[PDB]
């Protein structure tokens, strides 16, 4: 039969955070996988999955939108956030199982592909080498290190890189992440120190990148509109591919964008057409970042179509492990209005051990694979060789 027989979760060490997975088995013996995350502000996702998965056993693996509709009803009062993350993780495992059942890549469930390769940017560059030097080397500890990381991206034929906010002139080099309580300064004011450091950092990065490579800047939730505006004015004369700003104020974000000489991206934390709508209504973004790992890829197709009707291009949010990358690859393959794809090129020394296939890059683009399902499977034996730690990420 085509019934779901079991829904399990697994977890392994990813250094400063854990990777999580859904493993869904059908009565046919087919296994569908997804990857999900709890460290990005998201304790409880596993608990959600364990409850919702109980309801799924006995149901048809083919009927993923039936499951979504039921799940949404059962959790309607507390929808969004970690509830919706659990639903999306399950959806993505179901899609893998269905694609494998029909012997096709996941993009064949999503309209077929319309491109073979997707341009990417090398994300968290040099962010990972500064913030998590024990896991990603060579460690970056100064402005010259910032420049050399940018030089490395260019030599490796990457077309674009994305950095964050760093303080260079107050002792050791460190991230400025007050939006996430590092440091705890909940007003999120932007002072002169923050501004001249941003400038110094980007000048060094541009130095290393050369004039052709594109530079993206992510400001996450690290200011209020006032401060975002001050940052953009400070950086008026830089050539930025986009400036990324997360906000739960469509009005505020729209105001910032209206006064921005750079393209503005946002929305990576949002769920469903519903949450995206007020941002589009407000003219708040140039580019909509869609987290398909969180939303589920099927729900994300609905969001991409909505953006398309507004002539807004989308970019997948992709900063986890290889299976997340392959999930997003299949989304990217199928979406016409695709801005670019995010990927972390810095890898854990054991990343490849955890998965059956690695993403393949060529001339700054990700090759879309053509194997049944997402294109890679977690390896149970390697997962068990890398036991998880207590929650990390934002909660470290």
Ligand X SMILES: O=C(O)CCC(=O)C(=O)O
Which of 46, 92, 266, 269 binds Na ion (CB under 5 A)? It is 269
Cα gap 260→229, rounded to integer Å: 8
- At which residue do the structure tokens 């059962």 appear? 74
162 is in an annotated binding site: yes
User: Residue 16 or 350: which CB sits closer to its own copies?
Assistant: 16
371 is in an annotated binding site: no
222 is in an annotated binding site: no
Within 213-232, which residues bind ligand X (CB under 6 A)? 218, 220
- Min dist. Cβ of residue 179 to Cl ion (A): 12
- Could you say which of Cl ion, Na ion, Mg ion, none residue 269 binds, taking C-beta under 5 to 8 angstroms by partner kind? Na ion
From the number of C-beta atoms within 10 Å of its C-beta (0-12, 13-18, 19+), residue 175 rates as middle
Within 173-212, which residues bind Cl ion (CB under 5 A)? 185, 187
Compute φ and ψ for 73, nearest 5 degrees. -60, -45
Stretch that binds its own copies, among 10-18, 137-145, 303-311, 356-364 (CB under 8 A): 303-311
123 touches ligand X by CB under 6 A: yes
Cα gap 32→11, rounded to integer Å: 16
Closest CA to 302 of 331, 265, 273: 273
Q: What is the DSSP letter of 365?
A: E
Cβ-contact 87, 95 below 8 angstroms: no
User: Residue 78 or 384: which CB sits closer to Na ion?
Assistant: 78
37 touches ligand X by CB under 6 A: no
133 is in an annotated binding site: no
Stretch that binds its own copies, among 14-22, 82-90, 163-171, 376-384 (CB under 8 A): 82-90
Q: Which helix (H) or strand (E) holds 314?
A: strand 313-316
Helix 81-101 to helix 297-309 angle, to the nearest 10 degrees? 100
User: Residue 117 or 371: which CB sits closer to Cl ion?
Assistant: 117
Numbered residues of the known binding site for Mg(2+): 77, 218, 244, 248, 268-269, 275
Chain residues that interact with Cl ion, rule: CB under 5 A: 185, 187
């Amino acid at each position: 039969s085509l019934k779901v027989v079991s829904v399990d979760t697994l977890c392994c060490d990813a250094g400063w955070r854990n990777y999580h997975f859904v493993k869904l088995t059908t009565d046919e013996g087919i296994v569908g996988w997804s990857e999900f995350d709890e460290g990005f502000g998201s304790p409880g996702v596993t608990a959600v999955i364990e409850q919702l998965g109980k309801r799924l056993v006995g149901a048809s693996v083919m009927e993923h939108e039936r499951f979504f509709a039921e799940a949404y009803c059962l959790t309607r009062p507390a929808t969004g956030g970690v509830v919706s993350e659990g639903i999306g993780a399950i959806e993505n495992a179901l899609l893998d199982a269905k694609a494998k059942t029909l012997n096709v890549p996941c993009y064949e469930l999503l309209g077929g592909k319309l491109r073979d390769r997707v341009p990417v940017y090398w994300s968290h560059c040099p962010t990972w080498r500064i913030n998590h030097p024990k896991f990603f080397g060579p460690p970056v500890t100064d402005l010259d290190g910032v420049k050399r990381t940018a030089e490395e991206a260019r030599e490796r034929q990457f077309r674009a890189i994305k950095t964050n906010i760093f303080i260079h002139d107050d002792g050791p080099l460190h991230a400025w992440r007050p939006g996430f309580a590092v440091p705890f300064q909940p007003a999120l004011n932007v002072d002169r120190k923050v501004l001249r450091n941003l400038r110094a950092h980007l000048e060094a990065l541009r130095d290393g990148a050369g004039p052709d490579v594109e530079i993206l800047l992510d400001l996450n939730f690290n200011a209020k509109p006032e401060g975002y505006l001050k940052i953009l004015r400070e950086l008026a004369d830089f050539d930025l591919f986009w400036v990324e700003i997360d906000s739960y104020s469509p009005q505020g974000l729209a105001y910032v964008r209206n006064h921005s000489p750079h393209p503005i991206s946002s929305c990576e934390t949002l769920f469903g057409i519903r949450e995206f709508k007020p941002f589009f209504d407000a003219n708040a973004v140039d580019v909509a970042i869609v987290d398909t790992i969180w939303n589920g890829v099927w729900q994300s197709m609905k969001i991409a179509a909505f953006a398309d009707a507004h002539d807004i291009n989308v970019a997948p949010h992709n900063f986890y492990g290889h299976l997340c990358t392959m999930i997003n690859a299949n989304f990217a393959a199928a979406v016409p209005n695709l801005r670019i794809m995010e990927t972390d090129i810095d890898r854990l020394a054991w990343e490849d051990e955890l998965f059956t296939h690695a993403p393949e890059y060529q001339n700054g683009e990700l090759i879309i694979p053509d194997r049944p399902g997402w294109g890679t499977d977690p390896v149970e034996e390697a997962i068990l060789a890398h036991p998880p730690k207590v929650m990390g990420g934002l909660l470290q």
